[PDB]
Amino acid sequence: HHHHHHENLYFQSSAKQDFAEGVKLWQENAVLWTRLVQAFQSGDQSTVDSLLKQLDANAARVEQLLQRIISETGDELARKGESLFQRNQQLFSQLKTLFSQGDEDTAKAVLEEIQSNLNQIQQIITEAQKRL
Secondary structure (H helix, E strand, O other): OOOOOOOOOOOOHHHHHHHHHHHHHHHHHHHHHHHHHHHHHHOOHHHHHHHHHHHHHHHHHHHHHHHHHHHHOOOHHHHHHHHHHHHHHHHHHHHHHHHHHOOHHHHHHHHHHHHHHHHHHHHHHHHHHHHO
16 A cells, blocks of 8 residues: 655555555445345335345445554545445335335335445545545
């Protein structure tokens, strides 16, 4: 890893490593969520639920990685991203309830919220890379 930024920044290479791992997990989540939406459209809640479990697991994994970045470096962007993943975790359990009830209408709206969160996370990733 390299940190040759012209600004006096204290980003750690081990934090950058954790960041890279978090991004890869997010990329996986992006694929899993994309498929989730496809399953949602087809009405296959059983696949959706399974994917939500994977999405939640990865979200927690990234959360931990971001906390490590905060602990070592103190990246405010990691904190921002963390809260977005934490919200997604909440929304994943919200979907679980909604699909258990059968309320796909609201579940759609929740998925839309998750989408916008993923977009914000992408922005965090982009800007974090700039600072790294």
